[PDB]
Amino acid sequence: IKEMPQPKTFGELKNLPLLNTDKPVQALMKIADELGEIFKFEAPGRVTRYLSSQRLIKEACDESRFDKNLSQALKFVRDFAGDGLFTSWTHEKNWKKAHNILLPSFSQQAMKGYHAMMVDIAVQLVQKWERLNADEHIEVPEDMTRLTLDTIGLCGFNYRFNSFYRDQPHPFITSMVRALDEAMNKLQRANPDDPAYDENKRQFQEDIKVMNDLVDKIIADRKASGEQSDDLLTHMLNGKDPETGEPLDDENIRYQIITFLIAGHETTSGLLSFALYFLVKNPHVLQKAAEEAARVLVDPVPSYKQVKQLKYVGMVLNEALRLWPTVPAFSLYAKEDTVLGGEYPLEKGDELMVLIPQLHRDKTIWGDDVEEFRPERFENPSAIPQHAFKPFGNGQRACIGQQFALHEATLVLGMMLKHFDFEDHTNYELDIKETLTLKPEGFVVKAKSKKIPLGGI
Template identity: 30%
Template structure:
């Protein structure tokens, strides 16, 4: 069902919200503490709250959606009323191109049809051995770490980047990792600054920020274009008796096609690769960082998860088939993603006046779906700040609204790589828990909102090696 009826509009109300600063509205609060602001205004004003930000004449108005039912309407049942035409998505598209994350309409549907076969459960499960090897390399390196002191955020970013680069590029892993580590942070910061600035200078202006972002973007594009060209050349040279073509995602992308949609162009392949790099690296790194951090704070949960891993696996490495046999470890991961969703907020623009949860969002208005606050909604999560993996027991999940937990979004634009992320995370946690006891200090962690959840301070942990046979 899409659109609104006269009865809907008549019964709807204007969203409440704080007046904020006389000049800048709620902009100072949002910049200082966006996550805390979302939780506070939900408590004070309800499940849909109107926030204004910026000076008069340049003031932006956003409708924050804090309920599972509202999220479901925006993302699923009334998704045709909303588009990815927000400032943030325009900035992401300017950097990453028109891949699955930012493309729309027929372009998106065509890309999704071409790429979906690469992310079937069977295909993704075939990457388990490579993921295990990367997790094993982390374990070996950690055993040589003085005092076992690590920054989990740095370590998990490094691990997931190596893992996703291996799956994407195969043998090109080392050169690719170096280029990505140097350039993605530059682009991420540039996207965030421009997304939340009322006045954005044209990207063609030679400002220091534009020039820095341009160099980073060019380096990433050059990396992807070079590897795509090499793969296409390899496929063209391959004869009947040569080894089978590669099974990394880039090789599969270069061969993806069907009679109706054709094949992906080199530029389209590059755009998909860039999206896979950021979505498959930063988001999973965040989930693993906080899963390990929370386990380090809750030794009884950690021991229960470890006992499950050792009972199920013994001394052998995990496989994709073991996921269903590790339910408690999966619950730990899901609860970590509830408390620290890698995508804490994302926006859509209303293409027509639409009523969501009895509140009118005007045509052209922006709806911000806020998983950070939805995951803390007391109507659906008792004592929401408490870490409790048993929230995700099957019987408790069945009694909860579908969109009360949405770390991968939802509806027709739900994340295509969610099974890959869950597989990578569970396999890695199993390897780390078998090898180490994790202790986390009580120091606070600085968080912010960017393209993904931003960790602004080290996430310290001490890793105590466990005895090995």
């Protein structure tokens, strides 16, 4: 047994005020650098322990001892995501039921079926950039969000957000971002119901209505449609769980739609933005990735098999996920009393937070050069020790859309690298914006076309 390190306190508020920053994860990473593999974080009537080492996180990932917990951030997101897959407890009937009903939507057969629609949106991104004038630059995260939101909309719901037809935000995105920002900001509130937050509450309810009005539109579009679809929404509306034999009810379907539109694009936009950022900051790595894209993507538009062949692009994405996993943490609770790492006693119900970016910087696993961007670390994924690399979470509660995200991002990054040479024209200083999720803010580049014709579709 050992005393646990803990950061600075603010009297009766304990550690709570440390979350009074617009960059909490980054603040927690700095605390982990100072305190080590584990530290306690107290708030009035609440406590959790932040883990940063693979040695302790591998134990936390033992599902016989710990189950997914809804962190305070997820409890706030649940106000609009309900018992959708991301914010449901493992023991709630609707978690396994929806998991069984929707898993087929991420099968290899399904991925092959989404490919053409991913190409449709990727072609729109490449055409936008080909059409820019000499003077112009690209707002990277903004365009990656256009791409990822449209891709989940089309592949998952046969709905076109038509984001490339807009210069300003879709009300959905504005409301989604503001809702996630509010959840993050509520983390530091000692008195959530003080009147000074009435405006925040009013705005939060307004943003939730906007998201629900969009769900209404997607559902109306499907009912009134003639096109026969067999996508995510088809399974949500018609699929039956093999175990219970039951389909989802209307309320849960609405929560899944909101969940998938948000989880199904926000983090992929972050991944693509960080990958491009690292590529322009590491010229030799960008050269290797571009060479592979040119060599592999020999047709007017990429085939599904060709995307699977973009090995180095895939390594680039994994190395971007290592340094800046866009869902930066996940939470666990102890199923029963147990001892963590042979020295930290936990009582049944105690919470743990896995700080993924810190796990990914564990020098005892990766070597000392953890801050370097080296895709080659992922040349042979099998040599990576179990539970050392966890950008998609753990076990039965791991990311259900992992393959969708990586196929979309590999396809798009491959096409980007094939069609343009990129320039960090402002020598951009990394600024990571936090809204629970992480993404570069203000990242801009110039893309000079290689003038390679694009195929139809």
